[PDB]
């Protein structure tokens, strides 16, 4: 057993012992390095009441490199493209070994609450978030209803 496996197992124990409120994450079959996560759309955001599915791939040198995390559910957001790739600093240069998958899920939750128009993945959605928020909120809630509900 590698430190990556022991650490992924420890994290799974901790999540069953003290569950999060608006996040479920678990292995897919017997592949401990392949998780699926659900997060709720945050209350007081255009995503509220939507369920969003995420794929989590753990590296074999976890926790010294970040998990690869992508949305499967489609979503209107400046930092998440059609392929479901997430622009998020802690999934890139700001990863640290002390971070856990639950800290990642909460960080992604907050990115739904507070998008990052500067340093975007979808310039068209970034443009709209900056200039006409009500439009972004209209379209985001439109996509949540079609895809996340």
């Amino acid at each position: 057993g590698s430190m990556a496996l022991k650490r992924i197992h420890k994290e799974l124990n901790d999540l069953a012992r003290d569950p999060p409120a608006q996040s479920r994450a678990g292995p897919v079959g017997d592949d401990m390095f392949h998780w699926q996560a659900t997060i709720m759309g945050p209350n007081d955001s255009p995503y509220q009441g939507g369920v969003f599915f995420l794929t989590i791939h753990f590296p074999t040198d976890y926790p010294f490199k970040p998990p690869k995390v992508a949305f499967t559910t489609r979503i209107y957001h400046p930092n998440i493209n059609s392929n479901g790739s997430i622009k998020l600093d802690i999934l890139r240069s700001q990863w640290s070994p002390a971070l856990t998958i639950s800290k990642v899920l909460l960080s992604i939750s907050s990115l739904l609450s507070d998008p990052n128009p500067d340093d975007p993945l979808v310039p068209e959605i970034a443009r709209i978030y900056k200039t006409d928020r009500e439009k972004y909120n209209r379209i985001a809630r439109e996509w949540t209803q079609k895809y996340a509900m």
């Binding site: 430190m3 022991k6 650490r7 197992h9 420890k10 994290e11 040198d61 010294f64 070994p97 002390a98």
Partner: protein
């Protein structure tokens, strides 16, 4: 709490960084191979692993905890020694 933020197990050969963060000797060692001169908790610059946290080592000798897997009562200073010779732990990995 005497947990290491990197391996999330009870501390083993505890080492204190410049920034006052406490890790297993082997965990802070390993972190500095991957992400060099960087604290794996607070990201602050590090010139080295740090020094033995002998104050933390000392109080762990007077602390106890039941093993997560087999529920036997273990001195915190001996926890690493137990989990590597705990059949349940071994039957998981």
């Amino acid at each position: 709490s005497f947990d290491c933020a990197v391996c999330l197990e009870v501390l083993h050969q505890p080492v204190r960084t410049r920034c006052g963060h406490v890790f297993c000797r082997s965990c802070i060692a390993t972190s500095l191979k991957n992400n060099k001169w960087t604290c794996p908790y607070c990201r602050a610059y590090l010139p080295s692993e740090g020094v033995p946290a002998t104050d933390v080592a000392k109080r762990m000798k007077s602390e106890y905890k039941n093993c997560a897997e087999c529920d036997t009562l273990v001195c915190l200073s001996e926890m690493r020694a137990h989990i590597r010779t705990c059949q349940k732990y071994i039957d998981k990995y």
